């Protein structure tokens, strides 16, 4: 059985508007630059776009600190430009998903300005205010973005809670007036015909009664602890009943911190919470849990075991998104592939094949369709991201970690790796801007750009385009069940996707040498659906493949 829906079979593209296309020379991407490139996305074969936050914001965290939920960000343009994006997407039969950030607002949001003015203001209980303990913060809560999660306010003498930047105070979801105002805000956007919502850090809305201290253990994985609020599902379901279920939308929940065996409660269709799981297990598989900027070695067997556990967790009643990178993570070809010149294009096509053959809604992050890479940051000042400055302050300026070792890691792990501007063409600043880009463009744009790829049939771009057409053509590549042929193999990633008699095999050689790979049991090849970097022909009934380094392919198997 399988309830098909548009959002299960969609291929989404994620646009980070600050870095997509600048159309007025200020160095920052804008709405009009999205509009201008919709035919490019339609040619790739995308039918839905998720945009990162597009609201009025002081940009401490690039739109995730929202100062007014009902205004367009000044740098992105006007409400008129927003409504044109919708209307021009509609002309092209594309659906828009927006980013809903209601764990916290900017400290400049009118609600916070009132709340901080004193204990008597009607907005006081819109945020979390607590007394110090012996002239220190109410408790030992750390922030994701550095220091304590409590900021002293001199006006009142009390501390306010901020899991993120001190300019992102957390909204008090235990206050029913807060939830009702957020619901009116959602209806403002949903009434404009938006087709999807992504809920940013949806699992942290419910705070822990009485705010007790975290134990030593809990301090080393506090992200998980902040997901343990006792009313989180009451609140998500109430939001579904009062708002989400009255419109026709797909909702995605970004559940950072949630242990994978707690994820299903958010997405089981019978629970009437959200539709699509954004889990972080796979994309953070190689990240230290205590020093969250540090990476550690990982293996293909580790990777594929997580793919399979995420897949099984969704089970019959949930549904996964699948992504290998996004605006919070290094670029996939650098992170999971080999980004050197001899291999980058083969590895990028290998990972596209993986992505576009998962039992999940795939999300392609802008630039990945070109094989864009991490950026060669050298000095701490080459980064923009508030998060990396928080890590530098906590670990390097306290003398706990040498600056150079810190940099060797954040070069690989920083969010700013995925925020360098999109490489449109080979002209100055890769045609992203007529001015000076807000974050420097990778010098590899001369070799990696959309103009060089869009009409080259062998390009990474056109291999993504071919895979998307393949996936739409073959229902088993969307709905088929997933079986990993060998979860312990560290060289060749091979799995099947099966619907009844229709059985397909995906095979990717993660090694930089030729690998021979004999199929298990009685499996043999009926057809080749596509391959990249193939040298040995595959004939009817072949039971073995000779895989070139970085070779990837999809095959139909004999019954
Ligand atoms: O969902 C988690 C979100 O948390 C914060 O508000 C981040 O800065 C953002 O990039 C991330 O996606
Ligand atoms: Ca601009």
TrEMBL record:
GO terms for biological process: oligosaccharide catabolic process. Transmembrane segments: none annotated. SUPFAM superfamilies: (Trans)glycosidases, Glycosyl hydrolase domain. The keyword Calcium applies. Keywords: Calcium, Glycosidase, Hydrolase, Isomerase, Metal-binding. Ca(2+) binds at residues 22, 24, 26, 28, 30. Pfam families: Alpha-amylase, SusG_C. The keyword Isomerase applies. Residues 14-419 form the Glycosyl hydrolase family 13 catalytic domain. One of its GO terms (molecular function) is metal ion binding. PANTHER family: ALPHA-AMYLASE FAMILY MEMBER, NEUTRAL AND BASIC AMINO ACID TRANSPORT PROTEIN RBAT. Belongs to the glycosyl hydrolase 13 family. This is Sucrose isomerase. It comes from Erwinia rhapontici. The lineage of its organism: Bacteria, Pseudomonadati, Pseudomonadota, Gammaproteobacteria, Enterobacterales.
């Amino acid at each position: 059985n399988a309830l098909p829906t548009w959002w299960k079979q969609a291929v989404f593209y994620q646009v980070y508007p600050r870095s997509f296309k600048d159309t007025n020379g200020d160095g920052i991407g804008d709405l009009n630059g999205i509009i201008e490139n919709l035919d490019y996305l339609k040619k790739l074969g995308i039918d839905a776009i998720w945009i990162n936050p597009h609201y009025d914001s002081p940009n401490t965290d690039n739109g995730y600190d929202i100062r007014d939920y009902r205004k367009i960000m000044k740098e992105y343009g006007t409400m008129e430009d927003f409504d044109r994006l919708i209307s021009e997407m509609k002309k092209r039969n594309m659906r828009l998903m927006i980013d809903i950030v209601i764990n916290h607002t900017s400290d400049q949001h009118a609600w916070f300005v009132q709340s901080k003015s004193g204990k008597n203001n009607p907005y006081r209980d819109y945020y979390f205010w607590r007394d110090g303990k012996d002239g220190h913060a109410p408790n030992n809560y750390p922030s994701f973005f550095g220091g304590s999660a409590w900021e002293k306010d001199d006006k009142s003498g009390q501390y306010y809670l901020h899991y993120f930047a001190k300019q992102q105070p957390d909204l008090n979801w235990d206050n029913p007036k807060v939830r009702q105002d957020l619901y009116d805000m959602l209806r403002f956007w949903l009434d404009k015909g938006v087709s999807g919502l992504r809920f940013d850090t949806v699992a942290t809305y419910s705070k822990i009664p009485n705010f007790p201290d975290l134990s030593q253990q809990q301090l080393k994985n506090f992200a998980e602890e902040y997901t343990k609020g006792p009313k989180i599902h009451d609140y998500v379901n109430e939001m579904n009943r009062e708002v989400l279920s009255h419109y026709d939308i797909a909702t995605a929940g970004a559940i950072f911190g949630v242990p994978l065996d707690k994820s299903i409660k958010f997405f089981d269709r019978r629970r009437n919470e959200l539709n699509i799981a954004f889990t972080f297990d796979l994309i953070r598989l190689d990240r230290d849990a205590d020093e969250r900027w540090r990476r550690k070695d990982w293996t293909l067997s580790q990777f594929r075991k997580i793919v399979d556990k995420v897949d099984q967790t969704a089970g019959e009643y949930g549904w996964n998104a699948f992504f290998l990178d996004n605006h919070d993570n290094p670029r996939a070809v650098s992170h999971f592939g080999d980004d050197r010149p001899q291999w980058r294009e083969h590895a990028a096509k290998a990972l596209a094949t993986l992505t576009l053959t998962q039992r999940a809604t795939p999300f392609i992050y802008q630039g990945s369709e070109l094989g864009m890479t991490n950026y060669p940051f050298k000095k701490i000042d080459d980064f923009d991201d508030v998060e990396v400055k928080g890590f530098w302050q906590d670990y390097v300026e306290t003398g706990k970690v040498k600056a150079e070792e810190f940099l060797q890691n954040v070069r690989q792990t920083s969010r700013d790796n995925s925020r360098t501007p999109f490489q449109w063409d080979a002209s100055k600043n890769a045609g992203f801007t007529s001015g000076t880009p807000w974050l420097k463009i990778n010098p590899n744009y001369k070799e990696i750009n959309s103009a060089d790829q869009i009409n080259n049939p062998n390009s990474v771009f056109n291999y993504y385009r071919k895979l998307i057409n393949i996936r739409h053509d073959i229902p088993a590549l969307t709905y088929g069940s997933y079986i990993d042929l060998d979860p312990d193999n560290n060289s060749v990633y091979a799995y099947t996707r099966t619907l009844g008699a229709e059985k397909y095999l995906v095979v990717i050689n993660f090694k930089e040498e030729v690998m021979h790979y004999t199929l298990p049991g009685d499996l043999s090849i009926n057809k080749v659906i596509t391959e990249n970097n193939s040298h040995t022909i595959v004939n009817k009934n072949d039971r073995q493949l000779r895989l070139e380094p970085w070779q990837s392919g999809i095959y139909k198997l004999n019954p």
